[PDB]
Structure 1
Amino acid sequence: MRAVNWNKKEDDFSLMFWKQNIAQFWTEEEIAVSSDKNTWVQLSKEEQIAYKRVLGGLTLLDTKQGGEGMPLVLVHLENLQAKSVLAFMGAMEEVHAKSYSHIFTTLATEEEIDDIFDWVDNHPLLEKKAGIITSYYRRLLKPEVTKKELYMAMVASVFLESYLFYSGFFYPLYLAGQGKLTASGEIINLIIRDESIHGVFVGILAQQIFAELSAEEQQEVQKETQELLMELYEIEMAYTEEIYTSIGLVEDVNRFVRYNANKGLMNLGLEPKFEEEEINPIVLNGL
C-alpha cells in the first residue's frame, strides 16, 4: 500500500494548494464580534431577519460540504497529495460552519437561534438545492465509482463552492461595505478567501478527469452540467426573491449570482453563461 511521499511530486499543483490552504488557516476565536452589536441594534426588523436567514442557509451548505462533499470526493482520488489538500479543505468547512454559530451567539438570544435553525431545517428551497448537490455526492457511497460520477460530484462541488453560497454572502458584504457588521464581515471574507481556492482546486481536479472521459462521456457531462446550472439558477431566483424582496435588493443579488456562476463555470474550464453586469459597488467594497 502506498504512503504519501511529499518529496516526489504527484502533480504540478497540490503542493502550492496545500501551502496556501494552511497559510490561510483561521479559527473563529480570532475575530471578536461583540463590536458588531452597535450596528446590529440599529438595523430594521426586516434587515435582521434577512441576515439571520442567509447565515442559516450558509451554515447548512458548509455542513454538507464538510460532512459529505469533501470526504466522499477525497476517498476516491488516487492522487495522495491531492487527497491531502481536500481533507484540509474539509476541516475548514467545519470551521466555516462553526463560525456562523460564533456570529449568532453574539447577535442573537438562545431562543432566536433555535428559531433560525428550525427555519433552516424546515426550508423547502434549502432542502431542494442542498438535495440536488448532495445527490451527486451520495452516488460515491460505493466501492468503485466511474469517472463520470466522480467528475459530476466535482462539478456539484464547484457549483456549491463558487456559485450557491453567493446569494448568501451578498448581504454580509453589502452591510460591511457600509461599515455595518464589519467584524462579522471579516469572518465572511475569511470564509470567502477559503472558498475561492476551494473552487479553483476542485475545478482543476475536475478538468483532469474530464480529460480521461471518452468523447461521448464528455458530451454527456457537458449537457448535464448545463442543465444542473439552470436548475440551480431557478432555485436561487426563488431563494433570492424570498429573502431580499423585503429590503429591495433582489436585482442586485441576482446580478451577483450570475457573476459567481460564471466564476464557477470558469473554474471548471467552461465558458461563461451570463453576460457580465456591474456588481453593486457597495458589495465590492465589502469584499
Structure 2
Amino acid sequence: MRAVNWNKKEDDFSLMFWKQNIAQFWTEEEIAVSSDKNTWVQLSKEEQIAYKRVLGGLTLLDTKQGGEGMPLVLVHLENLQAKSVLAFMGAMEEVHAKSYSHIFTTLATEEEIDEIFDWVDTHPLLEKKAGIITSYYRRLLKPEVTKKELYMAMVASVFLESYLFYSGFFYPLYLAGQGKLTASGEIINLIIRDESIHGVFVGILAQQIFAELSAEDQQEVQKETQELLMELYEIEMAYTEEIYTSIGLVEDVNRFVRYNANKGLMNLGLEPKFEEEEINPIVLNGL
C-alpha cells in the first residue's frame, strides 16, 4: 500500500496548489467585524434580511462542500498528492463556514441567528439545489466508483465552488463596494480568494479524468454536464428572484450568476454558454 512521496511528482500542479492553499491560510479571529455595526444600522430591514439569507445559503454550501464534496471526491482519487490538496481545501471550507457565524454574532441576536438557520434548513430552493449537488457526491458512497461517477462529482464540485456561491457573494461584495459592511467584506474576499483556486484545481482534476474516459462515457458526461449547468441555472434564477426582488437587484445578480457559470465552465475546460458581460462595477469595487 502506497504512502505519499512528495519527492516524486505525481502530476505537474499539485505541489504548486498545495503551497498556494497553505500560503493563503487564515481563520476568522484575524478579522474583527464589530466596526461593521455602524453601517449595518444604515441598511433597511429588507437589505439586512437579504444579507442574512444569502450568508445562510453560503454557510449551507460550505457545510456540504467540507463535509461531503471534498471528502468523497478525495477518497476515490488515486493521486496521493492531489488528495492532500483536496483534504486541505475541505478544512478551509469549514473555516469559511465558521466565518459566517463570526459575522452573524456581530450583526444579529441569538434568536435572530437561530431564525436564519431555521430558514436555511426548511428552504425549498436551497434544499433542491444542495440536493442536486450532493446527489453526485453521495453516488460515491460505495467501495468502487466509475470514472464517470467521479468526473460528475468533480463537475458538481466545480459548479458549487465557481458558480453556485455567486448569487450569494454578490450582495456582500455590492455592499462592500459602497463602503458598507467592509470588515465582513474582507472576510468574504478571503473566502473568494480560496474558492477561486478550489474551482481551478478541481477543474484540472476533472479534465484529467475526462481524458481517460471512453468515447461513449465522454459523450454521456458531456451532455449531463450541460444539463446540470442549466438545471442549476433555472433554480438560481428562482433563488435570485426570491432573495433580491425586495431590494431591486434581481437582474444585476442574474448577470453575475451567468458570469460565474462561464468561469466554472472554463475551469472544466469547456466553452462559455452565456453571453459575455462585464462585471457590475460596484461589485468590482467590492473585490
Please tell me the TM-score bracket, short chain as reference.
over 0.9
CA distance in 1, matches of 2:279, 2:210: 31
Unpaired runs of 5+ in structure 1? Answer: none
Query: What is the deviation of 1:137?
Result: 0.1
Query: What is the deviation of 1:52?
Result: 0.2
CA deviations over 1:146-165 (Å, ceiling 9, x no partner): 00000000000000000000
Give 3-state SS (helix, strand or coil) of 1:178's partner: coil
CA distance in 2, matches of 1:91, 1:278: 33
CA distance in 1, matches of 2:199, 2:279: 20
Query: What is the deviation of 1:278?
Result: 2.5
CA deviations over 1:98-151 (Å, ceiling 9, x no partner): 000000001100000011001000000000000000000000000100000000
CA deviations over 1:7-47 (Å, ceiling 9, x no partner): 11111000000000000000000000000000001100000
RMSD across aligned C-alpha pairs, in angstroms? 0.4
Give 3-state SS (helix, strand or coil) of 1:113's partner: helix
Displacement over 4 Å in runs of 4+: none
Give 3-state SS (helix, strand or coil) of 1:8's partner: coil
Query: What is the deviation of 1:277?
Result: 1.2
Query: What is the deviation of 1:97?
Result: 0.3
Query: What is the deviation of 1:279?
Result: 2.1
CA distance in 2, matches of 1:61, 1:148: 23
CA deviations over 1:35-78 (Å, ceiling 9, x no partner): 00000011000000000000000000000000000000000011
Query: What is the deviation of 1:81?
Result: 0.4
CA distance in 1, matches of 2:182, 2:276: 28
Query: What is the deviation of 1:186?
Result: 0.4
CA distance in 2, matches of 1:190, 1:37: 20
Q: Give the match for residue 10 of structure 2.
A: 10
Contact 1:36 1:182 in 2 (8 A): yes
Q: Give the match for residue 202 of structure 1.
A: 202
CA distance in 2, matches of 1:212, 1:78: 13
Contact 1:173 1:286 in 2 (8 A): yes
Q: Give the match for residue 235 of structure 1.
A: 235
Unpaired runs of 5+ in structure 2? Answer: none
Contact 1:177 1:286 in 2 (8 A): yes
| Range 1-10 or range 190-199, more displaced | 1-10
CA distance in 1, matches of 2:104, 2:153: 31
CA deviations over 1:165-207 (Å, ceiling 9, x no partner): 0000000000000000000000000000000000000000000
Contact 1:175 1:286 in 2 (8 A): yes
The TM-score, its normalising length taken from structure 1, stands at 1.00
CA distance in 2, matches of 1:217, 1:81: 26
CA deviations over 1:231-275 (Å, ceiling 9, x no partner): 000000000000000000011000000000000000000000000
Aligned ranges 1:274-285 → 2 under 5 Å: 274-285=274-285
Contact 1:63 1:94 in 2 (8 A): yes
Contact 1:35 1:183 in 2 (8 A): yes
Contact 1:252 1:279 in 2 (8 A): no
CA distance in 1, matches of 2:150, 2:51: 35
Contact 1:178 1:286 in 2 (8 A): yes
Q: Give the match for residue 184 of structure 2.
A: 184
Q: Give the match for residue 252 of structure 1.
A: 252
Q: Give the match for residue 69 of structure 1.
A: 69
CA distance in 2, matches of 1:277, 1:2: 48
Query: What is the deviation of 1:219?
Result: 0.7
| Range 276-285 or range 235-244, more displaced | 276-285
CA distance in 1, matches of 2:140, 2:187: 32
Query: What is the deviation of 1:216?
Result: 1.0
Aligned ranges 1:116-265 → 2 under 5 Å: 116-265=116-265
Please tell me whether residue 89 in structure 1 is matched to residue 89 in structure 2.
yes
